[PDB]
Design a protein around this ligand. Structure first.
Ligand SMILES: Cn1c(=O)n(CCCO)c(=O)c2c1nc(Oc1cccc(OC(F)(F)F)c1)n2Cc1ccc(Cl)cc1
Ligand SMILES: Cn1c(=O)n(CCCO)c(=O)c2c1nc(Oc1cccc(OC(F)(F)F)c1)n2Cc1ccc(Cl)cc1
Lengths: 606, 127, 66, 114, 57
C-alpha cells in the first residue's frame, strides 16, 4: 500500500478561534479576517487593499481612508489597479499622490541596471514586466496623459523592441504591444465628424499619420475612416473615381500615360498655370512616373533590333537611355541623403541596378579609348572590356524590369498577393541555408572520388569540356564544377552517363552513382516537400492580416507622391500664434474621444 | 473557383518571364547564326540539336517557357566562338530564372491553392 | 518616477448632488437621473428613449407618451 | 512558476551542479525545462564571460564570435601549459568552449576540401 | 527547441571534454541543503494551492 499522510503539516493553534483569542487568525489558506470580510462583501490590515482592488470597488474607498501574500513583494496598489483595468478604481487611486517607477531603457548598463540583474535577475525582470504591464493600460493612458495616441505609439514601439532583447518572456511583451496598438485604434474609431478626424491626423501635412507609419502602427493606419480620407487626397482631381467603370478607368489612365512628356514640360515652363498644376495631384504624378518607367523598359527591348568593332561608339538607343540612367542615379542620391534606407528591400535592387550602369559606362569608355580598329569577335579574349560591359548591361536589364513588381501594391487584386508573397520569402531564405549544407557535403564527397579522372579539353569530342556541352563530361572533376553539376540536377538537366569514366572501374562508378542518388533523394523528395509543407503553414497564418498589411503598404506608397520634391519624372529630373490654437483644438477632440471611448468600454463589460 | 486566383498568379509570372527574357536576349543576340550554318539546315529549339535559343526575343520567350517543363537542354547556353565569361553569365541568368520559377513561384501557387480550396469546400454543396 | 495625475479633469460642482440642487446630475460617465432610472428598471429627457430602446421594453411605452 | 526570487530558484534546480535539471532532462520534462525563469538562469551560465550578450548588435556579435574562432589554437595551448592562469581559464566558459569546438571542426572540413 | 538547446548547452558545462579533438589526444551540508529545499517546497505548494483555489472561477 501507499500510506498517505500530511507532509509538512500546518498548525492549528486553538479551536476557540475556529469560529470567528487572536484576531489575526490565519486559516489553512492564509485567509485572515479582513480577507474573508473582503471576499464576502460584508463592508492589522497588511496588504488587504490589494485583495480589494482585485475584485471590485465598494470597500476600496473604505480601506483608502482608514507573512504569506498572494502578491509579489513589488506590486503597488496603483500597479495592480492598472493591471485590472478598472476605470473607477484607477481614478480613485490617481486622485491622490501616486507614482510609478520609470523604467530606465532597453539597453541600460548603469550601476543598478547591472547590480540588480546580478543579484536576483528574476525579481528584476518580474518588476520590469509588472511596471510595463501597468503603464500599458488603456485606462491609465486615458486619464493622466496629455495625448494618449502618441503615448500608445511610443509604448507599442518600446514593448515590441523589448520582446526581442528580452529573449524569454517574448509572449507577454507582444501581447502588451498588441494591447497598446489596439487601444490607439479603438480611440480613432470614436470620431463622429470629419472635422475632428483631420485635427487628429494633422497634429504637430499629415504629421500624425507619418508618426504612425514610422512606428509601424498597421491598425491605426488602415482604419476605414483614415483610408477614406487618404483616398480623397490621392484622387485629388477625380471626384468619384470609385463609381466609374473599369474600362472608363483603363482608358482614362492610358490617356494620362500617353501625355506624360506634355504634363511634364509644363511645371518647368509654367509652374503656376492650369496645365502646370495637373501633375501635382498625386494620382496623376503616379501615372506619369509609371508611364515614364514603361518608356525606359520599352526602349531597353529595342536595343537588340558592325559587331566586330573592339570599341564601338554609343548607339542611338544608348544615347536615348543616358538621360534616364543619369536621372535614376541622381534621384537615388537624394533619397538616401534625406535619411539614413536598407529596411526597404527595394532600395537594394535599386542601388545595385545603378552601380551596374556605372560599371557599364566605365567600361564602354575604357574600351572606346585604348582600342582602335575592328578584329573578328571570334578571337577576342574572355576578359575583354566590350564582353564585360555587354554582360553587366544585361544583368542590370533584368533588375530594371524586376522593379515593376513594387507597383503591385497600388492595385486591389494583385496588391495583397505581392504583400503576402514577400512575407513567405523570409522563411525560404532560412530554408536555403539548410540546402547549402547538403550541397556542400555532397559536392565534397563527389569531388573526392572523381578528381583522378579529370581529362583535358582536347581529349573530348568537339574540343569542349564541362556540363554545358552536348555530351556532358567532367561533371565532378573540380569543386566549382561539382557544385554546378549538383545545382543543375535539381531541375533534371544533368544526364546519368556523367557518372562513368573512361578507364571503367565498376566499383567507383557505382559508389559515385549512389552518392548522386542519395543526393537526389534528400534534395528532391525530402527537402523539397518540406519547403511546401512550411509554405502551406506560413501562408495560412498570413492571409489573416493580408488586408491590413496591404493597406499599410499602399498608404506608404501613396504618401511618397504627396510632397513636391520629386514631382518631375526621371527623364526631366536632371533638366507660436497658431501653434497654440492648433494644440488647443486637439485637446478638446481628445477629451471627447476619451470620454466616449470610456463610456463605450464600460457599457460593453457585460 | 480556384481558377480566378490562378489567373492573377499568371500575372506575376509574366513579369519574371519578360525580365529574364530581356536579360537573356540582351546577352546572346550577337551570336545569332543562320539556318544554313546549323546541322540538318534547321534553326530553333524544336530541332533535334537545339540552337539559337536566346537569339530573338520571340525565341527567348519560348525557350524560357519550355524550361518550366524541362524540355530545354543546357548546352543551348554555349556559343561557337566560345567565350567563357559570357557563357557563364548566360547560364547563371538561366539558373536564377529556374530557381525563381520552379522552386519559389511554383510552391507559392500550391500554397495558395491549398488555402483557397479549404475556404471553398464549405459552400461546395450550395454552389 | 512617473507622477500620475488626472489630465483634462472633469467638473464636480457640488457634494449634496452626489446623493440623489439640479435634477440634471451628470455623473462622471455622463449618466443623468433618467439614465440611471432606465438602466435599473425602476419605471429634461433629451434622448433617453434611445437608451431604453437599446435594452428592453418596459419603459419604452412610458417615454413614448410623456 | 511560483518562485518569487532567484535564491529559491537555484535551491530547486541544484537539489541532490544542476542536479534536478538533469533529472528533468532524463525524464523528458520538456515543460519544466523551457520555463522562462529556468532558461534565464541557464543563459547566464552559458554566457559566463559576456555580461549582456543580449543587448549587443548582430555585427558586434559576429565579429566577436569570429575573433574567438580564429584564436582556438592559442586558447587551447593554454589550459595545457597554464591550467590555472588568466588566459587558461578563458576556455572553460561554456560559450567560448563551444566556439572553439566548432571552429576546430571547421578547420577539419576546410582541410578535407584541400 | 528549447529542450534540445538546453541539452546542447549542458554538454559544455562539465570539464571532461574541455579541449578540442586536435589537442584531445596530446552529511554535514547534506542536511541543511535538504532542509532549505523543504522550506522552498512548502512555500511553493502553499502559494500554488492558493492561486489554484482562487482561479477556479
Ligand atoms: C539511394 N539509392 C540509390 O542511390 N540508388 C542508386 C544506385 C545505382 O547506381 C538506388 O538504385 C536506390 C537507392 N535507394 C533505392 O531504394 C529505395 C527504396 C525506398 C525509397 C527510395 O527513395 C525513393 F522513394 F525512391 F525516393 C529508394 N534504390 C533502388 C534499389 C537499388 C538496388 C537495391 Cl538491392 C535495392 C533498391
Ligand atoms: C543561382 N545559381 C546558379 O545560377 N547556378 C548556375 C551557375 C553555373 O552556370 C549555380 O550553379 C548555383 C546557383 N545557386 C547555387 O547555390 C544555391 C544555394 C542554395 C540554394 C540554391 O537554390 C536551390 F535550392 F538550388 F534551388 C542554390 N548554385 C550552386 C553553386 C555554384 C557555385 C558556387 Cl561557388 C556556389 C554554389
Amino acid at each position: 500500500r501507499i500510506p498517505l499522510q500530511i507532509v509538512r503539516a500546518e498548525t492549528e493553534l486553538s479551536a476557540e478561534e475556529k469560529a470567528f483569542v487572536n484576531i489575526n487568525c490565519m486559516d489553512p489558506l492564509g485567509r485572515s479576517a479582513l480577507l474573508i470580510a473582503i471576499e464576502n462583501e460584508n463592508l492589522y490590515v497588511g496588504d488587504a487593499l490589494l485583495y480589494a482592488i482585485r475584485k471590485e470597488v465598494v470597500g476600496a474607498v473604505e480601506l483608502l481612508l482608514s507573512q504569506f501574500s498572494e502578491f509579489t513583494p513589488d506590486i503597488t496598489p496603483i500597479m495592480l489597479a492598472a493591471h485590472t483595468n478598472n476605470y473607477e478604481i484607477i481614478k480613485l487611486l490617481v486622485q491622490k499622490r501616486v507614482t510609478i517607477p520609470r523604467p530606465h531603457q532597453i539597453r541600460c548598463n548603469c550601476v543598478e541596471c547591472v547590480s540588480s540583474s546580478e543579484v536576483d535577475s528574476l525579481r528584476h525582470s518580474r518588476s520590469r514586466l509588472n511596471i510595463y504591464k501597468a503603464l500599458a493600460s488603456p485606462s491609465l493612458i486615458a486619464l493622466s496623459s496629455e495625448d494618449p495616441i502618441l503615448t500608445a505609439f511610443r509604448l507599442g514601439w518600446e514593448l515590441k523592441e523589448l520582446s526581442k532583447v528580452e529573449n524569454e518572456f517574448k509572449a507577454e511583451y507582444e501581447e502588451l504591444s498588441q494591447q497598446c496598438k489596439l487601444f490607439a485604434k479603438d480611440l480613432l474609431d470614436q470620431a463622429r465628424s470629419s472635422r475632428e478626424l483631420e485635427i487628429i491626423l494633422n497634429h504637430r501635412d499629415l504629421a500624425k499619420l507619418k508618426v504612425a507609419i514610422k512606428y509601424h502602427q498597421k491598425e491605426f493606419v488602415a482604419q476605414p475612416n483614415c483610408q477614406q480620407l487618404l483616398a480623397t487626397l490621392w484622387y485629388d482631381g477625380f471626384p468619384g473615381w470609385r463609381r466609374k467603370h473599369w474600362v472608363v478607368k483603363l482608358l482614362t489612365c492610358m490617356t494620362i500615360g500617353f501625355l506624360f512628356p506634355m504634363l511634364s514640360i509644363a511645371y518647368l515652363i509654367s509652374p503656376r498655370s492650369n496645365l502646370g498644376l495637373f501633375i501635382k495631384k498625386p494620382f496623376i504624378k503616379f501615372i506619369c512616373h509609371t508611364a515614364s518607367y514603361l518608356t525606359f523598359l520599352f526602349m531597353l527591348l529595342l536595343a537588340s533590333q558592325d559587331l566586330h568593332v573592339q570599341g564601338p561608339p554609343p548607339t542611338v538607343v544608348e544615347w536615348m537611355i543616358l538621360p534616364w540612367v543619369l536621372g535614376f542615379i541622381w534621384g537615388e542620391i537624394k533619397e538616401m541623403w534625406d535619411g539614413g534606407y536598407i529596411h526597404d528591400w527595394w532600395n537594394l535592387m535599386d542601388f545595385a541596378m545603378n552601380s551596374l550602369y556605372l560599371a557599364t559606362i566605365s567600361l564602354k569608355i575604357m574600351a572606346y579609348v585604348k582600342y582602335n580598329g575592328s578584329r573578328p569577335r571570334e578571337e577576342w579574349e574572355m576578359w575583354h572590356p566590350t564582353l564585360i560591359a555587354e554582360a553587366l548591361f544585361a544583368i542590370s536589364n533584368i533588375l530594371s524590369s524586376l522593379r515593376l513588381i513594387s507597383l503591385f501594391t497600388a492595385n486591389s487584386h494583385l496588391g495583397p498577393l505581392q504583400i503576402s508573397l514577400g512575407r513567405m520569402l523570409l522563411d525560404i531564405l532560412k530554408f536555403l541555408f539548410i540546402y547549402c549544407l547538403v550541397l556542400l557535403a555532397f559536392a565534397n564527397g563527389l569531388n573526392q572520388l572523381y578528381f583522378y579522372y579529370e581529362t583535358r579539353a582536347i581529349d573530348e569530342p568537339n574540343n569542349c569540356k564541362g556540363i554545358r556541352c552536348e555530351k556532358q563530361n567532367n561533371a565532378f572533376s573540380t569543386l566549382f564544377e561539382t557544385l554546378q553539376s549538383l545545382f543543375w540536377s535539381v531541375f533534371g538537366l544533368l544526364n546519368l552517363y556523367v557518372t562513368n569514366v573512361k578507364a571503367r572501374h565498376e566499383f567507383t562508378e557505382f559508389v559515385g552513382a549512389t552518392m548522386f542518388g542519395t543526393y537526389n533523394v534528400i534534395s528532391l523528395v525530402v527537402l523539397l516537400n518540406m519547403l511546401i509543407a512550411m509554405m502551406n503553414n506560413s501562408y495560412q497564418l498570413i492571409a489573416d492580416h493580408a488586408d491590413i498589411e496591404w493597406k499599410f503598404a499602399r498608404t506608404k506608397l501613396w504618401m511618397s507622391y504627396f510632397d513636391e520634391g520629386g514631382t518631375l519624372p526621371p527623364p526631366f529630373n536632371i533638366i507660436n500664434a497658431d501653434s497654440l490654437i492648433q494644440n488647443q483644438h486637439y485637446q478638446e477632440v481628445i477629451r471627447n474621444l476619451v470620454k466616449r471611448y470610456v463610456a463605450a468600454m464600460i457599457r460593453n463589460s457585460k
